[PDB]
Protein backbone atom coordinates (compact mmCIF):
# COMPACT_ATOMS: atom_id res chain seq x y z
CA UNK A 1 0.00 0.00 0.00
CA UNK A 2 2.92 2.39 -0.80
CA UNK A 3 2.47 5.63 -2.89
CA UNK A 4 4.44 8.66 -4.28
CA UNK A 5 4.05 10.72 -1.09
CA UNK A 6 5.61 7.94 1.00
CA UNK A 7 8.33 7.45 -1.64
CA UNK A 8 9.26 11.13 -1.34
CA UNK A 9 9.34 10.93 2.46
CA UNK A 10 11.65 7.89 2.21
CA UNK A 11 13.85 9.46 -0.50
CA UNK A 12 14.49 12.79 1.17
CA UNK A 13 18.04 13.39 2.40
CA UNK A 14 20.22 16.28 3.51
CA UNK A 15 22.12 17.69 0.50
CA UNK A 16 25.07 19.99 1.29
CA UNK A 17 26.66 20.58 -2.12
CA UNK A 18 24.99 22.17 -5.14
CA UNK A 19 25.59 22.71 -8.80
CA UNK A 20 26.32 26.26 -9.84
CA UNK A 21 22.93 26.88 -11.41
CA UNK A 22 19.82 28.68 -10.51
CA UNK A 23 16.54 27.34 -9.27
CA UNK A 24 13.28 28.06 -11.11
CA UNK A 25 11.08 30.69 -9.44
CA UNK A 26 8.06 28.34 -9.63
CA UNK A 27 9.94 25.72 -7.52
CA UNK A 28 10.82 28.27 -4.84
CA UNK A 29 7.18 29.44 -4.74
CA UNK A 30 5.96 25.85 -4.29
CA UNK A 31 8.48 25.19 -1.48
CA UNK A 32 7.07 28.25 0.39
CA UNK A 33 3.48 27.12 -0.23
CA UNK A 34 4.48 23.73 1.11
CA UNK A 35 5.94 25.34 4.27
CA UNK A 36 2.74 27.33 4.88
CA UNK A 37 0.63 24.07 4.64
CA UNK A 38 2.05 22.79 7.93
CA UNK A 39 -0.18 22.06 10.92
CA UNK A 40 -0.13 24.83 13.60
CA UNK A 41 -0.91 24.98 17.31
CA UNK A 42 -4.30 26.73 17.68
CA UNK A 43 -4.00 27.51 13.97
CA UNK A 44 -1.95 30.60 14.68
CA UNK A 45 0.26 30.16 11.61
CA UNK A 46 3.20 31.91 13.24
CA UNK A 47 5.72 31.21 10.47
CA UNK A 48 7.66 33.86 8.57
CA UNK A 49 10.00 32.96 5.70
CA UNK A 50 12.99 34.99 4.50
CA UNK A 51 14.10 34.02 1.00
CA UNK A 52 17.75 35.02 0.74
CA UNK A 53 19.27 35.42 -2.75
CA UNK A 54 21.81 38.15 -1.96
CA UNK A 55 25.31 36.68 -2.49
CA UNK A 56 26.89 38.87 0.14
CA UNK A 57 24.35 38.01 2.85
CA UNK A 58 24.61 34.32 2.02
CA UNK A 59 28.43 34.40 2.24
CA UNK A 60 28.44 36.54 5.41
CA UNK A 61 26.10 34.06 7.09
CA UNK A 62 28.23 31.16 5.87
CA UNK A 63 31.28 32.69 7.56
CA UNK A 64 29.48 33.24 10.86
CA UNK A 65 27.46 29.98 11.11
CA UNK A 66 29.44 26.89 12.16
CA UNK A 67 27.54 24.22 10.19
CA UNK A 68 26.10 26.26 7.28
CA UNK A 69 29.35 26.60 5.26
CA UNK A 70 27.56 25.30 2.18
CA UNK A 71 25.77 28.63 1.93
CA UNK A 72 28.79 29.81 -0.14
CA UNK A 73 27.78 27.35 -2.88
CA UNK A 74 24.03 27.88 -2.64
CA UNK A 75 22.29 30.48 -4.86
CA UNK A 76 19.46 30.79 -2.32
CA UNK A 77 18.31 29.82 1.19
CA UNK A 78 14.97 29.92 2.97
CA UNK A 79 15.15 31.07 6.57
CA UNK A 80 12.25 29.57 8.54
CA UNK A 81 11.26 31.85 11.41
CA UNK A 82 8.48 31.97 13.97
CA UNK A 83 6.59 34.91 15.46
CA UNK A 84 7.13 34.10 19.14
CA UNK A 85 4.79 36.99 20.09
CA UNK A 86 1.92 35.07 18.46
CA UNK A 87 2.67 31.48 19.54
CA UNK A 88 4.68 29.51 22.09
CA UNK A 89 4.36 26.57 19.68
CA UNK A 90 6.34 28.50 17.07
CA UNK A 91 9.38 26.18 16.98
CA UNK A 92 7.13 23.09 16.65
CA UNK A 93 4.93 24.58 13.91
CA UNK A 94 8.05 25.88 12.15
CA UNK A 95 9.75 22.43 12.36
CA UNK A 96 6.71 20.94 10.59
CA UNK A 97 6.93 23.82 8.03
CA UNK A 98 10.62 23.18 7.55
CA UNK A 99 10.02 19.47 6.97
CA UNK A 100 7.40 20.33 4.30
CA UNK A 101 9.98 22.57 2.61
CA UNK A 102 12.56 19.76 2.63
CA UNK A 103 10.01 17.31 1.22
CA UNK A 104 8.95 19.81 -1.44
CA UNK A 105 12.58 20.36 -2.47
CA UNK A 106 13.16 16.62 -2.81
CA UNK A 107 9.99 16.15 -4.90
CA UNK A 108 11.14 18.73 -7.50
CA UNK A 109 14.62 17.32 -8.00
CA UNK A 110 16.29 19.75 -5.62
CA UNK A 111 18.46 19.21 -2.59
CA UNK A 112 18.23 21.03 0.71
CA UNK A 113 19.48 20.77 4.30
CA UNK A 114 18.13 22.00 7.64
CA UNK A 115 20.87 23.97 9.38
CA UNK A 116 20.05 24.96 12.96
CA UNK A 117 19.79 28.56 14.05
CA UNK A 118 17.60 27.91 17.13
CA UNK A 119 18.44 26.69 19.75
CA UNK A 120 21.78 28.46 19.48
CA UNK A 121 21.45 32.07 20.55
CA UNK A 122 24.58 33.19 18.74
CA UNK A 123 23.38 31.70 15.42
CA UNK A 124 19.98 33.28 15.85
CA UNK A 125 21.71 36.65 16.32
CA UNK A 126 23.75 36.16 13.09
CA UNK A 127 20.55 35.54 11.16
CA UNK A 128 18.79 38.46 12.89
CA UNK A 129 21.64 40.80 11.96
CA UNK A 130 21.71 39.93 8.24
CA UNK A 131 17.96 39.67 7.68
CA UNK A 132 16.85 42.53 10.00
CA UNK A 133 14.46 40.38 12.01
CA UNK A 134 12.28 42.15 14.55
CA UNK A 135 12.95 41.00 18.14
CA UNK A 136 9.82 38.78 18.26
CA UNK A 137 10.66 36.93 15.05
CA UNK A 138 12.91 34.02 15.94
CA UNK A 139 14.83 32.00 13.35
CA UNK A 140 14.42 28.23 13.55
CA UNK A 141 16.69 27.18 10.71
CA UNK A 142 18.48 28.23 7.58
CA UNK A 143 17.77 25.97 4.61
CA UNK A 144 20.24 26.29 1.74
CA UNK A 145 19.04 24.57 -1.41
CA UNK A 146 19.95 23.92 -5.01
CA UNK A 147 20.33 21.19 -7.59
CA UNK A 148 22.45 18.46 -5.89
CA UNK A 149 26.11 18.36 -7.01
CA UNK A 150 26.48 14.64 -6.17
CA UNK A 151 23.39 12.44 -5.87
CA UNK A 152 23.39 10.19 -2.79
CA UNK A 153 21.38 7.39 -1.30
CA UNK A 154 18.90 8.36 1.33
CA UNK A 155 19.49 7.12 4.87
CA UNK A 156 17.58 4.00 5.88
CA UNK A 157 16.68 4.80 9.48
CA UNK A 158 13.99 2.23 10.19
CA UNK A 159 14.67 0.78 13.64
CA UNK A 160 12.23 -1.68 15.13
CA UNK A 161 13.67 -0.97 18.59
CA UNK A 162 12.06 2.49 18.51
CA UNK A 163 8.50 0.99 18.25
CA UNK A 164 6.70 0.28 21.54
CA UNK A 165 3.23 -1.29 21.82
CA UNK A 166 0.95 0.23 24.53
CA UNK A 167 3.77 0.68 27.06
CA UNK A 168 7.51 1.36 26.77
Ligand X SMILES: Cc1cc2nc3c(=O)[nH]c(=O)nc-3n(C[C@H](O)[C@H](O)[C@H](O)COP(=O)(O)O)c2cc1C
Hey, which residues between 9 and 38 contact ligand X (CB under 6 A)? 13-14, 16
Phi, psi at residue 63, to the nearest 5°?
Answer: -65, -35
What whole-number distance in Å separates Cα of residue 113 and Cα of residue 154?
A: 13
Indicate whether 153 belongs to the interface with Cl ion (CB under 5 A): no
8 A C-beta contact, residue 75 and residue 18: yes
Task: Give whole-number Cα distances, 135 to 4, 67, 88, 101, 119, in Å.
Answer: 40, 24, 15, 24, 15
Determine if residue 96 is labeled as part of a ligand binding site.
no
44's contact among Cl ion, ligand X, its own copies, none, with CB below 5 to 8 A by partner kind, is none
8 A C-beta contact, residue 93 and residue 44: yes
Hey, which residues between 14 and 33 contact Cl ion (CB under 5 A)? none
72's contact among its own copies, Cl ion, ligand X, none, with CB below 5 to 8 A by partner kind, is none
Q: Can you tell me which of 21, 25, 153, 158 binds Cl ion, judged by CB under 5 A?
A: 158
16's contact among its own copies, Cl ion, ligand X, none, with CB below 5 to 8 A by partner kind, is ligand X
Q: Which is nearer to ligand X, 24 or 122 (CB)?
A: 122
Indicate whether 14 belongs to the interface with its own copies (CB under 8 A): yes
Mention every residue, 6+ apart, whose C-beta is less than 8 A from residue 20: 73
Q: How far is CA 160 from the centre of its chain?
A: 27
Indicate whether 119 belongs to the interface with its own copies (CB under 8 A): yes
22's contact among ligand X, Cl ion, its own copies, none, with CB below 5 to 8 A by partner kind, is none
Three-class DSSP category at 54:
coil
Q: Which stretches of the chain bind ligand X, using CB under 6 A?
A: 13-14, 16, 39-41, 43, 67, 89, 92-93, 96, 113-116, 155
Amino acid sequence: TGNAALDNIFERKSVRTYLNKGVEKEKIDLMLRAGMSAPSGKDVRPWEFVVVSDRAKLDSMAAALPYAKMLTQARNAIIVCGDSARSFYWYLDCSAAAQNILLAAESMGLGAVWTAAYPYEDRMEVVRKYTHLPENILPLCVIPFGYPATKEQPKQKYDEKKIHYNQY
